[PDB]
RNA sequence: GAAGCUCAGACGAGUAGGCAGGCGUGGAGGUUUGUGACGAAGCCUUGGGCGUGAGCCUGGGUCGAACAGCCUCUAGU
RNA sequence: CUGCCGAAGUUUCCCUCAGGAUAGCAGAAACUCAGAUCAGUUUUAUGAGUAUGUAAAAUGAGAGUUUCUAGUGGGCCAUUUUUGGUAAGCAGAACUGGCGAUGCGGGAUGAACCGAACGUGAGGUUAAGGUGCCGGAAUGUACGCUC
RNA sequence: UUUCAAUGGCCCGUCUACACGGACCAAGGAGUCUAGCAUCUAUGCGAGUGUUUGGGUGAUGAAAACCCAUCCGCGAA
RNA sequence: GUACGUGAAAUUGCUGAAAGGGAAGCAUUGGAAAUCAG
C-alpha cells in the first residue's frame, strides 16, 4: 500500500500545481490582450496615438531547399537549425537576430505568431530533444526530466515559457527539436521565391504568417 | 502474421536477354557512362538493401514455414520440437526407399513435408 | 513506451493527460453586453476623413 | 577445466552434435531438451541437466551428477517411463521441482510431442 | 573499440567478467581495465619488478598492503637482488618474475583473482607500462 | 593464403662486449649468489667476465656491499673505484 | 548461439579511393552412425520455393558411379 | 554480391625533369577539457579613415589534437569587379558559385535554364511549370490592348 | 508463361560527340610466386630471444613428429 | 550400332501456339489464354 501511495499523492499535488500554474498563465494572456485593447481604445478616444510593441518572439520557416545556396547563407541555416525545407524554429527577435535574418531573407519567411500557433505546434508537432534524440512530448514527465532545473513541469509551462519569452527561452531550445512541417495545404503563392511584399512568399510577413502555419502544420 | 514480399520479379542482369553469353545472374554495372549505373528513368532497377523483407517473415514459404533440408531419418527426428516453424525438404539425391521411410517418420512427428508427392 | 503518437488536438483523452486544466477552461466569456461604449475620438474622425 | 572454457571451445564453432544451416544452428545432442545450442541448454558444456528420448513405445530420462561427472560410464543415469502420457508429466515435473526450473517448460513440452508420436504412429 | 582483437578464450573470459563489472557498478577502475584489456599488444607495454618496487616504496610510500595492478606483463629485473614483499595482479608474469616474488615476498594474482578480492579496485595502484618502448 | 587476399575482392573492379656493475652479480650461479652475497665470509667470490663473453667492465649501477673479485681485460675508470668501497678487489686478466 | 536478447532516435546519391560482411570453384585435415545402381555427378525444364544480391533448395525428364553439409587449411579459384 | 565512408583539381613549397610534395579532403590509432573549446554567421563596444581590425553579446555544436596513408593537383559554364581597347566583337586578371561523382519534376527536345539532392512502399500535400486537344488539371472569373 | 494496351526506355565496353572494339556460342584467359624492407594485428617467451647448418631418435610406414648441441644473429650502451 | 558413355550452347528443320501497316528487344500496371500453388 505504501511507497506507491506517497508517489501517487506527490504525483497528485504536482497535477494541481500545473493546473494552478496554467490558470495563472491563461489569466496573464487574457489580461495582456485586454490591456492591448483598452490602451488602444483610450488612445484613439482622447486623441494621442498608441504605438505597437516591439516583439521579442518570431517564428521562422525555411522555404528553399538545400541546393544552390551561397556558403554565407547555408552557414546561417546551420546556426538557425534550419537544415531542411519547410522546417521551422523560434528565434528571440533582437538586433543580432534581426540583422542576421536579412542575410537569408529570400530563403526564409518570418513573422510574429500569437498564442494559438505556439500551442498547436507543441501539442501536435512538438518533438522534444531528449538525450540527443527526437522524443515526442506525449507526457508531462518528459518535459519535467529535461526542464525541472528551470521549474518547467508541463507542456503548458513550456508554452508560456516560449510564447511570453521567459529567461529560459535559450534553456528550452535544445530541449525542443525543429518543427518539421508539411507542405502547406492550398499551396504557396503563385511565385514563391519573391519577397512577401512583392507578391512572393519569402521574407518578413507579420500578421500573415499565422495563416501560413495553419496550412503548413 | 501475413508474409509480405516487397518484390517478386528477380533482378535480371543488364542486356541478359539480347545475348546468350551474358547470363541472367545479376552483375553490378561498372561502366562510368552506364545509363543503368546512373539509374536513369525507365532503366531496369538495381538490388538495394531497401528491398530486404521483414526479419519476422524472412525465409518463410508462402504458408509461413521455413525450409530445412533433410537427408535421412535422423534429420527429421531433430525437427520434432519445431513442427510449427520448420517444414522438411527431402533432398534430391535420397533414394526411393529412404524417401518413403522419411516421409512416414515425418508424418508420425507431424512435421510438414513440401515434396512428399515423390 | 509510446508506440504511437496521438494529437491532443484530436484525441480528447490525451488533453486530459497533458492538461489537468481543460476540464474547466470556459473559452467564451461575456465581456461585452447591450451596453457597448462606442469610442472614437472626434479629431480622430477629422484626421481619418482628411485629404 | 571449467564450464565456460568448454563452452568457448565446443559450443561456438565445432561439435559433433551441432548442425549449422543458412543462419541457424541446432544441437542434435541426445541430452539437450530444446534441441538448440546455447550456454543454458548445452549438454557437453554445462553441469547436470535433464532430458527425455523415445524408445519403442516409451520415454526415458538422462541426468548428471557433479561428483561422478569425471567417470563417463555412469556419468549419466537412465530412468524409464512407460505408463501414461499424463503420469509422465507429473513424474517429470516432480523430478525437477527440487531442481532448477528453467528447463521444465521445454522438458515437459518435449514429452507430449514424443507421446504424440505413439498416437500418430498408432494411427 | 568494442571488443578485443585476440581470439584467446581466456582473455575473452576476462572481457566477459569485466564488462559485467563495468556496466553493473560505477567503479571507474573497472572501466579503466576494460578499456585497457581491449588494447593491442604494443599498447600494453611490460612492467618490471624493479619499477613496481620503486613505485610502491616511493617518497611517502603509502603502499603498505595495497595490491599493485597492471594490465600486461610483469617482467623481472635482474639488476635488483633484494625484492620486497609485494602483492601484484597482472595478465601474465614471466617465469623468473613469478619465482622471485614467491620465494622471497608476497603473492601473485591474476585479474580474476583481483576481482574476487577487490571488485571495486579498493586500495590498489593501477600502474602502466612504459609506452616509449 | 590467397583466399583472404585483396585479389579475391577486386573481381569486376579491374671486439669488446660490455658489462656494467649492475650485472656482475647476475653472472654467478644462483647457489654462489645464495651462499656468498651478504655473508661476512673471509673469502670473496670471483667473477670472470671473459667467461661470459664480455671484454670491458663498465661501471653503471649500484653495488651490494659484499666483497667480490672481478677478473677482466679492460675496465672503465670509475668501475674500479665503485668496487673499492664495495669491499672487493679488481685484478686484470692478461 | 554475452559472438545473445531488448528499447529508443537519427540517417540513406556517389567517381578515385578507404573499410566490413557474404555467395561460388578445385584439392587437404577433422566431423556428420552423412547421400547413392530402389540411380551419384552432370544435363534439360511453359514445375515449385528461398535470398536485396552473389547464389541456393526442390518437382518431373534424361542419365549411369560416384558425391555432399559443417569447422579449418589451401590455390593454376 | 551487398553494405558503409567518400575527395581532388587548386592549394604548401620544392625542384634537372615529370613530378612530387604539402595542404585540403577522406580517413586509421592514442590522449586532454564538459569547456568560451570552437564557427565559410550576426551583433555591441573600441581605435584608424557601410565596411577595417581587436575585444565582447547573439547563435548552433562537445570541442582538440600530435602521429601514418591512400586518391586528386585538371577544365568548362555563369555572376561580380576590369585596364587595354573598335564598325564590330576582343583581350586581361581577381573573386564567386555550379559542374565533374548527380539521378528526379518542368522548360516540345538539350552538358549548365527553373525547382529539387535519391533506401522499399502506402497515403496526403506542394515546388517549378502549367489547366482548348494531344496531356494530368477552370473552353474559369474580372478589367483592358491588339486585325 | 505467352501476348496485348497505356506509359517510359539511344548500344555496350574503352579513351577523349565521336573515334576504337564487338557476327554467334562453348572452353581457356590476366596483381602470381619469392627475397629484402616498413607499418599494423595476433601468438610464444622476456633481458633475453631464435635450434630444423648439424647430431640423436623415429621401421612400422620415416621427407613427419620428438629430443639434444647457442658457434652465431638481433637486443642489453 | 563402331559418325558408338554423358550429349550443353551457338545453329538448322518439322509440328503446335502467338504477334507483326517502315524494326525489335527491356521495364512498370493490369486484362486475356495456359498453368500452378496453398
PDB file of C-alpha atoms (C1' of nucleotides) in Angstrom, chain B residues 28 30 39 46-52, chain F residues 9-10 13, chain G residues 9-21 52-53, chain H residues 1-7 26-28 118-120:
ATOM      1  CA  UNK B  28      26.753  -4.773 -60.976  1.00  0.00           C
ATOM      2  CA  UNK B  30      30.814  -0.984 -63.642  1.00  0.00           C
ATOM      3  CA  UNK B  39      19.799   4.969 -62.608  1.00  0.00           C
ATOM      4  CA  UNK B  46      19.350  -2.483 -59.159  1.00  0.00           C
ATOM      5  CA  UNK B  47      19.373  -4.608 -55.985  1.00  0.00           C
ATOM      6  CA  UNK B  48      19.448  -2.459 -52.870  1.00  0.00           C
ATOM      7  CA  UNK B  49      19.273  -3.159 -49.162  1.00  0.00           C
ATOM      8  CA  UNK B  50      15.933  -1.343 -49.152  1.00  0.00           C
ATOM      9  CA  UNK B  51      14.233  -4.367 -50.707  1.00  0.00           C
ATOM     10  CA  UNK B  52      15.084  -6.558 -47.724  1.00  0.00           C
TER      11      UNK B  52
ATOM     12  CA  UNK F   9      37.756  -8.987 -53.830  1.00  0.00           C
ATOM     13  CA  UNK F  10      38.683  -6.997 -56.954  1.00  0.00           C
ATOM     14  CA  UNK F  13      36.872  -3.888 -60.324  1.00  0.00           C
TER      15      UNK F  13
ATOM     16  C1'   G G   9      16.459   8.163 -32.113  1.00  0.00           C
ATOM     17  C1'   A G  10      18.545   9.929 -36.498  1.00  0.00           C
ATOM     18  C1'   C G  11      20.159   8.910 -41.187  1.00  0.00           C
ATOM     19  C1'   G G  12      20.309   6.526 -46.682  1.00  0.00           C
ATOM     20  C1'   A G  13      23.345   9.824 -54.455  1.00  0.00           C
ATOM     21  C1'   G G  14      28.299   8.603 -55.257  1.00  0.00           C
ATOM     22  C1'   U G  15      33.914   8.624 -59.362  1.00  0.00           C
ATOM     23  C1'   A G  16      39.449   7.705 -57.500  1.00  0.00           C
ATOM     24  C1'   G G  17      39.874   5.708 -53.065  1.00  0.00           C
ATOM     25  C1'   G G  18      39.223   3.554 -47.642  1.00  0.00           C
ATOM     26  C1'   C G  19      36.513  -0.455 -44.750  1.00  0.00           C
ATOM     27  C1'   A G  20      33.311  -4.564 -43.471  1.00  0.00           C
ATOM     28  C1'   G G  21      30.347  -8.872 -44.246  1.00  0.00           C
ATOM     29  C1'   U G  52      18.065  -7.043 -51.612  1.00  0.00           C
ATOM     30  C1'   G G  53      22.010  -9.778 -54.262  1.00  0.00           C
TER      31        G G  53
ATOM     32  C1'   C H   1      27.470  -9.722 -54.471  1.00  0.00           C
ATOM     33  C1'   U H   2      25.699  -6.407 -50.899  1.00  0.00           C
ATOM     34  C1'   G H   3      26.682  -2.667 -47.171  1.00  0.00           C
ATOM     35  C1'   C H   4      29.467   1.567 -45.110  1.00  0.00           C
ATOM     36  C1'   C H   5      32.763   6.052 -45.506  1.00  0.00           C
ATOM     37  C1'   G H   6      33.966   9.043 -49.554  1.00  0.00           C
ATOM     38  C1'   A H   7      37.535  13.595 -52.076  1.00  0.00           C
ATOM     39  C1'   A H  26      38.708  11.199 -46.729  1.00  0.00           C
ATOM     40  C1'   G H  27      40.292   8.683 -43.109  1.00  0.00           C
ATOM     41  C1'   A H  28      43.100   4.974 -39.197  1.00  0.00           C
ATOM     42  C1'   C H 118      17.770   9.560 -54.330  1.00  0.00           C
ATOM     43  C1'   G H 119      16.849   3.011 -49.321  1.00  0.00           C
ATOM     44  C1'   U H 120      11.432  -0.365 -50.455  1.00  0.00           C
TER      45        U H 120
END
